[PDB]
Structure 1
Amino acid sequence: GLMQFTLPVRLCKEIELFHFDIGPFENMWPGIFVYMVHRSCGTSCFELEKLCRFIMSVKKNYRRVPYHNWKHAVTVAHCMYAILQNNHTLFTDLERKGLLIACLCHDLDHRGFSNSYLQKFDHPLAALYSTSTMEQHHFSQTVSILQLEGHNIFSTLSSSEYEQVLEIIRKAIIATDLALYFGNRKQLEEMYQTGSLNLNNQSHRDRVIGLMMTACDLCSVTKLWPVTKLTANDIYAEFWAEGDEMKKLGIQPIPMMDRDKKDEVPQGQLGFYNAVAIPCYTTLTQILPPTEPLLKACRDNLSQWEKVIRGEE
């Protein structure tokens, strides 16, 4: 009960910042996450024994893939922590609880392949879940881990609060399907501008949480340039393996997944910042002003990719 996690000074300070990198020491990641839950949620939010056992079972159900791995889970959870800490009063007790866990669980049992490759392969998951295939799996896996003996971290919620939190986690995880992001942001864009956006309206809150999830999920583009550039290598390592597997099915992959088109990465990054990342952090900053450092860092990284194309790096 009186048992806080404490980080070294450099981490205690930098963890509060949006651009924090959780470092290469895997064995510190569980304690970093508990630390973030304790400060975000409270030392009483979760029985520490049950939380520690949930965290180690989540870790075991992430695979050794170049990008969609345990490091990503904790990185996405830290971005959510930074958003919640800069927006203290906008979120309920249940939401602070549910979202950090949602982020930790959001890519459980990822195989390093997109929804499209599952459909073209005719994977069994694509017959069980026709849309948002992997994201319905990540939620399924999250519920399975919650129901292991000694793993139910929500045990001390009422029946209605329990159902509310699983509903928050389900929507938060489905929202990480980037195919749903385009329409969610446009609806939020219209609502913010026409002035109809109402945070007491549950369907509006749902949309805002969806965009927060996209923002945390993409947060590699909000790090300092050296972190962003080295993460890009892991992202392409997965995509190019998927492209290889497309060629094995007799299907030309899109250029993003074709290792032969490595040369086009800098221009592919520009499209991605302009079509996906910048709009995401712009709409999020309009709705949640204190998240502006995410937009600022994303713009700095756009400018670094522009330098790459001009042969200045």
Structure 2
Amino acid sequence: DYNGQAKCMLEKVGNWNFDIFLFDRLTNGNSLVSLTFHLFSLHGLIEYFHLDMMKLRRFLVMIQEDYHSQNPYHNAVHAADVTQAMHCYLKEPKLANSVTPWDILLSLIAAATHDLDHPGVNQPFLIKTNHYLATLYKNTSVLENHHWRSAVGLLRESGLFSHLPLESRQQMETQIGALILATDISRQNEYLSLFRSHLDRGDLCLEDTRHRHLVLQMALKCADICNPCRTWELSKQWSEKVTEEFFHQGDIEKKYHLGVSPLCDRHTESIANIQIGFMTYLVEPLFTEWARFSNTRLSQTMLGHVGLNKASWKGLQR
């Protein structure tokens, strides 16, 4: 019964108002696997790369279960959402008309795994608590590097692409890594500035692999923080979950005298002030530039929701 209603939702998987929460409820927490598997079929990746469907399900399942379902925000549901948003961007004219099956393949996988095995606390927390991951990656894109090497781990263990040449598997790993590392919010000014320069010069050539992947990296960055770009009802749920996770890190910091990180203090920081600032300083600048690149209706819609949703947070004050 429930698994019959899920199929129908996937018919509108390219819709910006797709309800990922419902989809995950109907599938019993199998949204990432169910949605990503469908996208592989939909983009014809199974045939294109002679994929063993048994190996594909195993791989997708290893990914989904490697997410901590206990994190209120960084879990497989969040991954599924980013993956779904990525799919809508790939449908945009300028990308649809230049990406190769291979690009779509790396895009979807990178989206599905960009927060793999996320611990639920940020980088500065891992650094000041001397977490081995911070040591391993020399306090640089600690989380993103961890998500990527984990992805490379599941890629190898699944043997999904064992029939492809080594060189190809290695490139797949390198390009997925470049896509995942671009999601390190900490380095957005560098990524946004570069993108902006190119949009000003108007020199981007989409038939060039490098330029095309810079764009794909910006699309992944968008997908990762497009929560405020969704309809209020969806955006509201994400705002509460990300804030809940932030506050939990804060409670731990307070309890163990580690110093309460910014945005993580439930006593001195409002969920509204957090969302407003986030939308004003990180979401809006990014999507404006993206709108300069992909000047379509989806871009207007997305910036539109950010406008409405933000006012609603201000409204929810005084």
TM-score by length of 1: 0.89
What is the rounded CA distance, in whole Å, between the counterparts of 2:181 and 2:300 in structure 1?
Answer: 23
Shift of 1:190: 1.4
1:193 aligns with 2:200: yes
- The CA deviation string for residues 26-67 of structure 1, in whole angstroms up to 9 with x for no partner, is 445222221111112434142210100001111121112111
Q: Which amino acid aligns with 1:37?
A: F
1:224 aligns with 2:231: yes
Do the aligned partners of residues 276 and 85 (structure 1) sit closer, same or farther apart at CA in structure 2, a change above 3 Å counting?
A: same
What is the rounded CA distance, in whole Å, between the counterparts of 2:5 and 2:306 in structure 1?
Answer: 28
Which moves more between the two structures, 242-251 or 213-222? 242-251
**Contact preservation (8 Å) 2:272, 2:316:** no
Shift of 1:72: 0.9
Secondary structure, in 3 states, of the residue corresponding to 1:20? coil
Shift of 1:202: 4.2
- Structure 1: where are the runs of 5+ without partners? none
What is the rounded CA distance, in whole Å, between the counterparts of 1:312 and 1:190 in structure 2?
Answer: 38
Which of 119, 136, 141 lines up with 1:111 in the alignment?
119
Tell me which residue corresponds to 1:280: 286
Shift of 1:88: 2.0
What is the rounded CA distance, in whole Å, between the counterparts of 1:103 and 1:245 in structure 2?
Answer: 29
Tell me which residue corresponds to 2:26: 25
1:80 aligns with 2:83: no
Q: Which amino acid aligns with 2:249?
A: E
What is the rounded CA distance, in whole Å, between the counterparts of 1:140 and 1:255 in structure 2?
Answer: 28
RMSD: 2.3
What is the rounded CA distance, in whole Å, between the counterparts of 1:244 and 1:21 in structure 2?
Answer: 31
Secondary structure, in 3 states, of the residue corresponding to 2:103? helix
TM-score by length of 2: 0.88
Do the aligned partners of residues 54 and 230 (structure 1) sit closer, same or farther apart at CA in structure 2, a change above 3 Å counting?
A: same
**Contact preservation (8 Å) 1:40, 1:81:** no
What is the rounded CA distance, in whole Å, between the counterparts of 2:55 and 2:257 in structure 1?
Answer: 47
Do the aligned partners of residues 256 and 51 (structure 1) sit closer, same or farther apart at CA in structure 2, a change above 3 Å counting?
A: same
Shift of 1:184: 0.6
- The CA deviation string for residues 150-195 of structure 1, in whole angstroms up to 9 with x for no partner, is x122223333332222221110111111112221111111111122
Do the aligned partners of residues 274 and 312 (structure 1) sit closer, same or farther apart at CA in structure 2, a change above 3 Å counting?
A: closer
For 1:95-174, what aligned pairs fall within 5 Å after superposition? 95-130=103-138, 131-148=140-157, 151-174=158-181
**Contact preservation (8 Å) 1:19, 1:224:** yes
**How many pairs does the alignment contain?**
305
**Contact preservation (8 Å) 1:188, 1:197:** no
- The CA deviation string for residues 212-240 of structure 1, in whole angstroms up to 9 with x for no partner, is 11111112222210111111111011101
Secondary structure, in 3 states, of the residue corresponding to 2:241? helix
1:310 aligns with 2:315: yes
Identity percentage of aligned residues? 25
Q: Which amino acid aligns with 1:108?
A: L
**Contact preservation (8 Å) 2:290, 2:299:** no
What is the rounded CA distance, in whole Å, between the counterparts of 1:309 and 1:300 in structure 2?
Answer: 14
- Structure 2: where are the runs of 5+ without partners? none
**Contact preservation (8 Å) 1:99, 1:169:** yes
1:35 aligns with 2:52: no
